[PDB]
């Protein structure tokens, strides 16, 4: 990604917001892979240390190695909007030129946290 955060050393606990619904991959999980949707992502170290990230797309390749892989475009902490309110209204109102650009930019703001 534009940033690189996680090594592949130790098994950890992570949740994923998939297109088949928000799931959870722990330990020797089945190589279940499908595209993720722009939403919140919860990551927790051992003993319950609270962390968080964000995802704007990509898959989550899993192999019987007890280690999860995740790729996206955005990967920052949650701590890191009047212009978006106009960009949201400007997306709601689109003419005959392909609207598709309008709807997609609002599905990433559905998290809003």
């Amino acid at each position: 990604l534009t940033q690189s955060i996680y090594n592949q050393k130790e098994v950890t606990q992570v949740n994923i917001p998939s297109t088949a619904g928000e799931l959870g991959i722990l330990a020797n999980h089945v190589p279940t892979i499908q595209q993720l949707k722009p939403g919140v992502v919860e990551v927790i170290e051992t003993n319950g240390e609270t962390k968080s990230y964000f995802i704007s797309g990509g898959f989550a390749t899993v192999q019987p190695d007890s280690e999860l892989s995740v790729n996206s475009i955005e990967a920052f902490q949650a701590e890191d909007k009047s212009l978006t309110a106009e960009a949201q209204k400007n997306a709601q109102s689109a003419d005959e030129a392909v609207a598709a650009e309008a709807e997609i930019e609002l599905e990433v703001l559905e998290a809003l946290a």
Binding site: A20, P31, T32, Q35, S69
Partner: protein, 267 residues
């Protein structure tokens, strides 16, 4: 002549000012290139290196191949675009005659358009002005899917770099949807019957970003070899043009004084 020696000195002596101040500037780019190479080498392999363990390569059927060359339009970077033209050509005659090429940059459109013009119809210039970003990868990868579907054997040609010593001519491969699905050991994955077509386009658009980063490092790590030798060959030209200037000055002082002594002692 004498008038142009000092004029030709000021050019060569100030060319040394340019080449010597492009050997360390590229050393800063290498630190930015590897951090832009680790942007794509520990990110894309997760969807490829582990994905190549399924080994969906070499479809046995014979169809039209595709070779996408990766380069930047900025020159003065050694012989990157010189051996790359041979690398595609050495496997062409002995690929055979069927091949198509997507040229990336201004320097490569004349490297292959003058040799194989029919083998391409779309090619954009303006790639390497700075460090390439992801947004420009989707502006060319989708255009490969916009022309026609066609090939199921797309292979990317880039330059590997190790220790920054030299470039490396190879031919990496990017699996296609038909090949991806036709895998002998793919049943270990359990995709929920979703779209398997987006798996190829996500990996293909990330091979380009992984090829526009390691080939962007072989450019910098070979630019120095074309800017370091341009400094030791300029210094070998300054010395031979500094001795000649001392010879010409020594000839002016005499051949003018002799012209005075002749005229003065004529009486």
């Amino acid at each position: 002549t004498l008038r142009e020696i000092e004029m030709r000195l000021k050019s060569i002596k100030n060319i040394e000012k340019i080449t010597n101040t492009m050997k360390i500037v590229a050393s800063t780019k290498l630190g930015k290139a590897q951090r832009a190479m680790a942007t794509s080498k520990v990110y894309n392999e997760a969807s490829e290196k582990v994905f190549e363990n399924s080994e969906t390569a070499v479809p046995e059927n014979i169809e039209k191949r595709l070779w996408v060359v990766v380069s930047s339009d900025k020159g003065l970077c050694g012989s990157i675009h010189s051996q790359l033209a041979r690398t595609v050509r050495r496997k062409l005659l002995d690929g055979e005659k069927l091949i198509d090429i997507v040229a990336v940059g201004e320097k490569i459109k004349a490297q292959l358009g003058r040799s194989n013009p029919e083998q391409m119809r779309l090619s954009f210039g303006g790639t390497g002005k700075e460090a390439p970003t992801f947004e420009e990868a989707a502006h060319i990868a989708d255009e490969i899917l916009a022309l026609d579907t066609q090939y199921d054997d797309i292979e990317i040609v880039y330059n590997k770099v190790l220790s920054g010593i030299s470039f490396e001519p190879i031919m990496k491969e990017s699996y296609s949807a038909k090949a991806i699905e036709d895998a002998p050991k793919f049943g270990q994955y359990e995709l929920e019957d979703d779209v398997v077509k987006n798996l190829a386009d996500f990996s293909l658009a990330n091979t380009i970003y992984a090829a526009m980063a390691e080939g962007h490092a072989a450019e910098i790590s070979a630019r120095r070899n074309a800017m370091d030798n341009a400094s030791k060959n300029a210094s070998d030209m300054i010395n031979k043009y500094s001795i000649l200037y001392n010879r010409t000055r020594q000839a002016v002082i005499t051949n003018e004084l002799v012209d005075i002594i002749t005229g003065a002692s004529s009486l």
